[PDB]
Amino acid sequence: MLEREKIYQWINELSSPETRENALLELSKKRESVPDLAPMLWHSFGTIAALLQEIVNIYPSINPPTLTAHQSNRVCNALALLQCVASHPETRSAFLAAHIPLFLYPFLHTVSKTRPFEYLRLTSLGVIGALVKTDEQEVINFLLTTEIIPLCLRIMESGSELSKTVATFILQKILLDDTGLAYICQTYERFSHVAMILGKMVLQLSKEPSARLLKHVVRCYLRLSDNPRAREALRQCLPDQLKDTTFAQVLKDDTTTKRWLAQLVKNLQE
C-alpha cells in the first residue's frame, strides 16, 4: 500500500515542472510492475497534457539538432509512459483518438546519428510498436492515413540495428493487415519503394547479420507475395541472397523464418 501511495504521489507530481522530472524517472521504472499504470496516467488530471508538454518542449532542440543526453533521457521517460498508455487495452483507443502519435512523428523524422537522437527515435518507435502489437484495424488505418510509412522506411534504410528492427516490425504489422497490404501495393511506386529498401536491407544483412531483423524482412516479403501484382514484381526483383545459401547457416535454428522463406519462394513459382 505504501508502494501504491508513492505511485499516486508521483502521478500528482507530473503536473508541476518543479517535480515532474523526478516523477517521470520513478514512474518509468514502474511500468513493468504496475499493471494499471496506464489507466491511472490517462484518467488523472493533466497527466497526458504534461507528457505532451515534455514532447513539444524538445521541438526547439530538433532543428538545428542540439538535443543533449540529459534532454533525451528526460523526454524518453515521458515517451516510455506514453508507450504504457498505448499498450493497455483500456487506454489504447483513447490514445489513438487523441492523435498522440502525430506529436512523435517529428522525432522519427530526425536524422542525426548522435546517441541522444538515436535513443529518441528508438523510444518513439517503441510507442508505435506498442500500438500495433495487437494488430487492431483502427490502429493500422490511422497509421495509413497519417503517412508514417515513409518515416519507417527511412529508418529501415539508415538507422541503428535496433531502430531498423522496430521500424521493420511496424511495417510488417501494417502489411499483415489487408488494408495495409492493399495500400502498399496500390501503386507500382509505393510497392517498388518498399521493395527497394527491403532489398538494400538484405544486402546489408548478408554482411552484418541480425537474426531478428532478417526475420522481419523475410516476413514482409512473404506477405507482399500475397498480392498478385507484388508477386509478379518480386519474381523479377527478389534478391539473389534470399534464393541461394547466403542465409542458410544463420537460419539453421530459426525454423520459423526458414519456413517463411520457403513459402515465399514457393509462392513466387505459383
Binding site: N12, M40, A49, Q53, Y59, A94, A98, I100, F103
Partner: protein, 242 residues
C-alpha cells in the same frame, strides 16, 4: 534549444511582412558581400517572399494537427468541471502552445530551402556573370543567410499560427460550452456520466478527478503552456502496374 531563444513573443510584429526587416541578420564576413556589398540589398525581399509563400499552409496544417489532440485531452481533463471558463482558458493555452510547436516543426526545413533558393536566384540575377568561383560564393552566402534568419522567419509564422489558433479552439469547443450552459439553464451542474461513474468506482481517491474545479495546484501543467511557448523566450513580466 542549445542557443537561447532570440525573440520574445512581443518582439515580432506579424501584421505585415515588414515585421521581419529590423531583425534580419547579415553576417558582414560573408565573402560574397566582401566582393559585392551591393548584393546585401537582395536579402530582405528573399526572406519576405519565403515567409509569404509558406505562412498560410503552415498555419493551417499546424492548427489542424494540434486541434484534435487539444480538444480530446481538455474534454477528458474537464469532464467533471461544470464551469466553461476554466476549460476555455486551459484549452486556449494548450492549443496555442501545441500549434506553435507544430508550426516550428513544419516550417523550419522548408524555410531553409526557400530562403536559400530565393537568395541564390536573386544573387544570380544581379550578377548575370556566372564564374565558378562566384557561384560558390553565392551558394555559400545563401546557405549562411538562410541558417542565420531561419529562427526569425519561423517565429513570424509561429506567431501568426498562435494568433489564429485560439478562436479556432473556441469554435471547436462550442458544444462543450453548450453542454454546460444547457445544464445550468436546467438547474444542473454538468458532469459527463461515464466519467462520473469511472472516477467514483475505479480511480484511487489520491488521483481521482473531483466534481468541480481542480485544485489550482493541478493546473500547473496548463499554466506552463502559457508561460513557455516553443520558439519564444518565456514570459516574465518582471511507372504503373499496367
Amino acid at each position: 534549444p542549445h542557443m537561447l531563444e532570440q525573440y520574445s513573443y512581443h518582439d515580432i510584429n506579424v501584421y505585415s511582412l515588414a515585421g521581419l526587416a529590423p531583425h534580419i541578420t547579415l553576417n558582414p564576413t560573408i565573402p560574397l558581400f566582401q566582393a559585392h556589398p551591393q548584393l546585401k540589398q537582395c536579402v530582405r525581399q528573399a526572406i519576405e517572399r519565403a515567409v509569404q509563400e509558406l505562412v498560410h499552409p503552415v498555419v493551417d496544417r499546424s492548427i489542424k494537427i494540434a486541434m484534435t489532440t487539444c480538444e480530446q485531452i481538455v474534454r477528458k481533463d474537464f469532464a467533471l468541471d461544470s464551469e466553461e471558463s476554466r476549460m476555455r482558458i486551459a484549452a486556449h493555452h494548450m492549443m496555442r502552445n501545441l500549434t506553435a510547436g507544430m508550426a516550428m516543426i513544419t516550417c523550419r526545413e522548408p524555410l531553409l530551402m526557400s530562403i536559400s533558393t530565393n537568395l541564390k536566384n536573386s544573387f544570380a540575377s544581379a550578377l548575370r556573370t556566372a564564374s565558378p568561383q562566384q557561384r560558390e560564393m553565392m551558394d555559400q552566402a545563401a546557405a549562411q543567410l538562410a541558417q542565420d534568419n531561419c529562427e526569425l522567419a519561423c517565429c513570424f509564422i509561429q506567431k501568426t499560427a498562435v494568433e489564429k489558433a485560439g478562436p479556432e479552439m473556441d469554435k471547436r469547443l462550442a458544444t462543450e460550452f453548450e453542454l454546460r450552459k444547457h445544464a445550468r439553464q436546467e438547474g444542473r451542474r454538468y458532469c459527463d456520466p461515464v466519467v462520473l461513474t469511472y472516477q467514483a468506482e475505479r480511480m484511487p481517491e489520491q488521483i481521482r478527478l473531483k466534481v468541480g474545479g481542480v485544485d489550482p495546484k493541478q493546473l500547473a501543467v496548463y499554466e506552463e503552456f502559457a508561460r513557455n511557448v516553443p520558439g519564444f523566450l518565456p514570459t516574465n513580466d518582471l511507372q504503373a502496374w499496367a
